Design an enzyme around this catalytic site. Structure first.
Site, short mmCIF file in Angstrom:
data_model
loop_
_atom_site.label_atom_id
_atom_site.label_comp_id
_atom_site.label_asym_id
_atom_site.label_seq_id
_atom_site.Cartn_x
_atom_site.Cartn_y
_atom_site.Cartn_z
N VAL A 185 0.85 -1.20 0.00
CA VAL A 185 0.00 0.00 0.00
C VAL A 185 0.89 1.25 0.00
CG1 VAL A 185 -1.89 1.17 1.18
CG2 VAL A 185 -1.66 -1.31 1.34
N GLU A 234 2.03 4.50 1.40
CA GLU A 234 1.95 5.34 2.60
C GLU A 234 2.27 6.79 2.25
OE1 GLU A 234 4.11 2.91 2.10
OE2 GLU A 234 6.13 3.48 2.74
N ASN A 269 8.76 -5.99 -16.13
CA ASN A 269 7.48 -6.56 -16.49
C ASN A 269 7.82 -7.25 -17.78
OD1 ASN A 269 4.66 -6.65 -17.02
ND2 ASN A 269 4.56 -4.55 -17.83
N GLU A 312 0.88 -9.94 -21.72
CA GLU A 312 -0.54 -9.95 -21.37
C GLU A 312 -1.42 -10.50 -22.48
OE1 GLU A 312 -1.34 -9.62 -18.40
OE2 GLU A 312 0.55 -8.77 -17.70
N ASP A 331 18.20 -28.24 -21.10
CA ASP A 331 19.35 -27.44 -21.54
C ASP A 331 19.07 -26.00 -21.97
OD1 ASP A 331 21.28 -29.30 -20.88
OD2 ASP A 331 21.10 -30.37 -22.78
N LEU A 353 23.58 -25.31 -15.04
CA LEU A 353 23.10 -24.27 -14.13
C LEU A 353 22.10 -24.84 -13.12
CD1 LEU A 353 22.72 -21.26 -13.30
CD2 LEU A 353 21.06 -21.05 -15.16
N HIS A 411 28.46 -30.62 -17.74
CA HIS A 411 27.37 -30.10 -16.91
C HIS A 411 27.40 -30.59 -15.47
CE1 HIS A 411 24.75 -29.64 -20.81
NE2 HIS A 411 25.85 -28.91 -20.82
N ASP A 445 24.90 -31.12 -13.63
CA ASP A 445 23.80 -32.05 -13.33
C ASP A 445 24.13 -33.49 -13.74
OD1 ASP A 445 23.27 -32.11 -16.06
OD2 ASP A 445 21.19 -31.45 -15.90
N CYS A 448 15.81 -37.67 -23.61
CA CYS A 448 14.64 -37.03 -23.03
C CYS A 448 15.07 -35.96 -22.05
CB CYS A 448 13.75 -38.05 -22.32
SG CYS A 448 13.26 -39.43 -23.35
CA LIG Z 1 3.32 0.78 2.33
CA LIG Z 2 19.38 -26.49 -14.79
CA LIG Z 3 0.99 -10.08 -15.61
CA LIG Z 4 2.72 -7.65 -17.77
#
Ligand SMILES: [Ca+2]
Ligand SMILES: [Ca+2]
Ligand SMILES: [Ca+2]
Ligand SMILES: [Ca+2]
Ligand SMILES: [Ca+2]
Ligand SMILES: [Ca+2]
Ligand SMILES: [Ca+2]
Ligand SMILES: [Ca+2]
Ligand SMILES: [Ca+2]
Ligand SMILES: [Ca+2]
Lengths: 653, 653
Positions: B127, B129, B152, B156, B343, B396, B456, B458, B632
């Site tokens: 919120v 303030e 962002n 959308e 990968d 990674l 790698h 892994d 796979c």
């Molecule tokens: Ca706040």
């Molecule tokens: Ca990974």
């Molecule tokens: Ca979104």
């Molecule tokens: Ca967005």
């Protein structure tokens, strides 16, 4: 540090043990199939624990004890002293099957213990302590730790033009005094076992930040070998047995900057040869970190050492009065026979626990002629951005130490003039601004200088110490003070008193107090310039933590050009030579009242009660007129702060 | 904040007063020459102090009191409430000379008080303030403060291919939910006085880091105006009187990276018009700071949400067994009909107090097909450096949360495989490494992967939670465990037991335990590979603060190529699907003893006592043979950590 060393199935394992580590040893993989139990023997200087599922039990040199073979039952092996030629250090494991108490197999571990430590002076006393546990970190503050390096930017011998750090060579043993010491300390037997070597190294990235030298003393004299640095990323160390030390000397090549924090690292590794075509395995690695010392400016409150002055050979009054002033002090006068000494150079310094020297910053394009022994040089050149008047060092100054809302700035704060963010005005080049910010310990503040034609903060403001105290004053140019004074003198019957008396090139103008006060457009220009000064006053009060009691206003007056920017109407008194209590003040040539300059008398009335002594210095008479420009320059070289920069705690970046 | 406003000689001064500041007012410069004393009147809502050399005295609205005119005697002017249309806020100063009590002159200050505050949610509760006093700073930790912004990076609506932040437009109100709120709150009379405007702005540098939108509700529907961002550095605000709020929405465009710390700033200034051709003067400025949220990886200990799987449509056993496994859990199975899911992608997340979503990192060159609503995308492309196998995301991974010698890593530590410093070997590209380091909250560690052909981490290591506890295990590939097991089975009479039973493409080879144990060069290769594993074991123990009790060794075996690098001899069991207590484990196809795989039985014997349930998953039968390659891939998308990244205190950079 725990390290994995496994016994090998049907074979003996030989390993180097580095003191300060310990080994966890798998005995299970080496046991024959179907073996049930194991026992062990070990030599005097090898300590052995049997560890069952985390529970550790110390074991004698020769016992008969047997343990169940399990993947979760292992050994912990420790040694507290280096091997000598008299050593046989070993652990031997016997294996047994369910039938019979005679061993069916044996696996063993033969050890050679050595000490390897890369040491520096992390505790910052100038001496290199043995294995400081904090040597791999660098922390700020009084309780902080880690080693410090100087950029070795001075020049030991005049024969080469460039600074010492521009090459990979050391000519003179004096150069080593600028360098930080690093010692590789080792202890061990006559030689490393077959397949091992010790190597010093640095990253590619750090290779243009440092160089590292070793001193040899062959037959015909001392010589200096560059073992790490530009285009040398590693050096194989020649190992000597017994207790040995190799002394290295480390120089910084670069100041902290945009994209370089100032921290660099050096490593030593013990490497194991595996086979041809396969990389060597680092067995053990030790690291030290250095921070390269920042470039630091000196405010006017610090003791003067040398007064550097540039002027023409025939400006006699100037030279006479400057010599007089300096004779009142202990300073050296240095004269060069036009503003370049103020505008092209800023005297800073660098300091490390083992040494420090002054260092000149050279403004963006004969100042490199100042480069010499223990007098250093640094410059920044914009690659793209154009240089303007704001890049000149009349636009670069620094405050005395201040405390701003609980936050201490023990070295003061750098001040540089700029324009408003949305103005589209001039600003000092990014490359220089980025450099000053990266030094971090002077936390720079931008003021507003772009209302001035030349655009320098030293045109409108200066600092002076208050004699007999620890305090200081901010001095500000004030047009309002000048108008008040002139209006008073006019009321007193002095309106016909003339400016610039004695400058023959100005005589036809006949400028009087009356003529000044009746010039309506000039009044409006100066009201506007006072708004520009007051805007700066507010930012200085905020960023330096100053109140009105800390400020004195000196009368000033300006004329506006076509860009609506200010130039001095009479010489700016605020830009003055400050040597402690004694002030060289540009002679204003103001209106004479009772055969004294009313500006001089007014300024004395402000400053003298505080114990400041004023000498007015005339640089313009040799030119017969004043057009707003100054033809002389001075720059004072000062002693460094007593406070050590490394004791500061700058804010997180 | 104190601000300088001077009375003007023979004229009235009109000024805007911003609440939260106060004025120091020179009355001396405006006094006529020869004036002796001054008095003052002021209105109800203006508080006035006369300050003599630092000593302040409150003054009535109309008194008759007179003070000596001095440059050191000034006013302090304060207002506590905004002006309305009913306001006349003023201070008037009368001047007197020595003769007579009637004023000879008057100077006055007419004020309009307004409130201006740019507000954000600095206390991180979601919120906004009113005027958080810490809103201009950003501090880490539980007691830390300052506002947070998401990149962002999701999309959308599907109509455009690119992520939301790649443009200057907002199409959908759903997009606003990803954005941080910023409110410009003001209070004042019907209009600003003549010559003033309010302006929001950002630096050129930050202009590619943010965008800021305002929502308008004109006649035909809601619309989104981009007021700050790429190629818009400032916006003049339309001022509305009374008590008003303007709501803005702020998006991040860029993750922290090399050369960008993640901090950005937004300013509002009240500007004063001076005259044409002259810049506007900032009168007052308010600043807020945002930190852009880092990209964060999820370790295997976190709850699984979705299991993403790639394979060929006809690998039936694989699909059947993976579906079986996932049916034991609450996870979604998502299948795409060859290792690219492991990968080419790493599932991370971003979080802010108001929102968070998963974000995919795309390995350097159809993974952008995962971009969608609240599923974000980020990638880094080397501009120069060539990509190698070490840039693949099988290389990674990230640890569970750990504490290493008193230092807490509440989000775990990122792990990436590399080569020894002096080896000249492969390393993940600098651009990706720099990116991971810049996120800072996962403090990455490099392991040694370059002994493997594919390279790698892994391939050799994984983590699993210990059911019913808060703890975890490190699982390591071990060749020594495999040799021990096979030597035991041989002693037991099983040496003729065959690998790869049922893979028809391998039948002519007839690989037996006997054949494996008698291959001398293979033994030596695997002893060397065990040294490579043990080197990693030691670094993991050091950098994760692990002991031998935290580790389990799974049998593994490798073959060496011409580069002296390892590939799997039989499928690597350590790289497994971890969904809490249930483990999908690649089927090893080891020697059959009593019609069970001895590798499967051995692994069950290690894991099952801890409450882990093992399912062996066969990806190779559809190919009839195993060459060291896996056909796979799986990647598990997990819930984010409960711990908020902003509560961490990372080390100084
Ligand atoms: Ca706040
Ligand atoms: Ca990974
Ligand atoms: Ca979104
Ligand atoms: Ca967005
Ligand atoms: Ca020391
Ligand atoms: Ca040199
Ligand atoms: Ca030197
Ligand atoms: Ca020197
Ligand atoms: Ca300067
Ligand atoms: Ca968009």
């Amino acid at each position: 540090r725990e390290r994995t060393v496994r016994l090998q199935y049907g074979s003996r394992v030989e390993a180097v043990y580095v003191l300060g580590t310990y080994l966890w040893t798998d005995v299970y993989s080496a046991a024959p199939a179907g073996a049930q139990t194991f026992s062990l023997k070990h030599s005097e200087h090898v300590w052995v624990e049997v560890v069952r599922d985390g529970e550790a039990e110390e074991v004698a040199t020769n016992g008969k004890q047997r343990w169940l073979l399990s993947p979760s039952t292992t050994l912990r092996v420790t040694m507290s002293q280096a091997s000598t030629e008299a050593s046989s250090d070993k652990v031997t494991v016997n294996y047994y099957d369910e039938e019979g108490s005679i061993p069916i197999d044996q696996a063993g571990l033969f050890l050679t213990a050595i000490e390897i430590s890369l040491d520096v002076n992390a505790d910052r006393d100038g001496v290199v302590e043995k294995n400081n546990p904090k040597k791999a970190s660098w922390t700020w503050g009084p309780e902080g730790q880690g080693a410090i390096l100087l950029v070795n930017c001075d020049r030991e011998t005049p024969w080469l033009p460039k600074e010492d750090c521009r090459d990979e060579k050391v000519y003179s043993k004096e150069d080593l005094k600028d360098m930080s010491q690093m010692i590789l300390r080792t202890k061990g037997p006559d030689r490393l076992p077959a397949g091992y070597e010790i190597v010093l190294y640095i990253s590619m990235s750090d290779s243009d930040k440092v160089g590292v030298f070793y001193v040899e003393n062959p037959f015909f004299g001392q010589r200096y070998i560059h073992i790490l640095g530009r285009r040398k990323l590693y050096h194989v160390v020649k190992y000597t047995g017994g207790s040995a030390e190799l002394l290295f000397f480390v120089e910084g090549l670069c100041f902290p900057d945009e994209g370089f924090s100032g921290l660099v690292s050096i490593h030593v590794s013990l490497l194991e040869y595996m086979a041809q075509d396969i990389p060597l395995t680092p067995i053990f690695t030790d690291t030290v970190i250095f921070r390269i010392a920042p470039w630091i400016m000196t405010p006017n409150i610090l003791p003067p050492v040398s007064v550097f002055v540039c002027c023409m050979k025939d400006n006699y009054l100037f030279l006479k009065e400057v010599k007089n002033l300096v004779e009142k002090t202990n300073c050296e006068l240095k004269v060069c026979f036009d503003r370049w000494i103020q505008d092209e150079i800023e005297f800073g310094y660098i300091e490390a626990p083992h040494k420090g020297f002054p260092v000149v910053l050279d403004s963006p394009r004969p100042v490199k002629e100042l480069l010499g022994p223990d007098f250093g040089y640094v410059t920044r050149e914009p690659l793209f951005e154009s240089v303007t008047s704001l890049d000149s060092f009349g636009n670069l100054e620094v405050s005395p130490p201040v405390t701003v809302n609980g936050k201490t700035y023990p070295l003061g704060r750098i001040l540089i003039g700029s324009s408003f963010p949305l103005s589209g005005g001039r600003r000092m080049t990014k490359v220089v601004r980025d450099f000053l910010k990266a030094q971090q310990v002077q936390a720079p503040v931008e003021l507003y200088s772009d209302w001035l034609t030349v655009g320098h903060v030293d045109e409108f403001m200066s600092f002076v110490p208050i004699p007999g105290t620890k305090k200081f004053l901010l001095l500000m140019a004030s047009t309002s003070a000048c108008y008040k004074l002139f209006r008073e003198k006019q009321k007193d019957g002095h309106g016909e008193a003339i400016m610039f008396k004695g400058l023959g090139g100005m005589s036809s103008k006949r400028i009087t107090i009356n003529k000044i006060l009746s010039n309506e457009s000039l009044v409006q220009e100066n009201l506007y310039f006072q708004r520009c000064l007051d805007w700066n006053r507010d930012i200085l009060k905020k960023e330096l933590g100053l109140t009105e009691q800390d400020i004195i206003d000196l009368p000033a007056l300006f004329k506006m050009d076509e860009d609506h920017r200010a130039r001095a109407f009479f010489p700016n008194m605020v830009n003055m030579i400050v040597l402690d209590k004694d002030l060289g003040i540009p002679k204003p040539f103001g209106p004479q009242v009772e055969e004294e300059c009313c500006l001089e008398m007014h300024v004395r009335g402000l400053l003298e009660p505080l114990g400041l002594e004023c000498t007015f210095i005339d640089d313009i008479s040799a030119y017969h007129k004043f057009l707003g420009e100054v033809h002389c320059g001075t720059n004072v070289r000062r002693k460094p702060f007593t406070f050590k920069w490394w004791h500061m705690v700058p804010s997180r970046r």
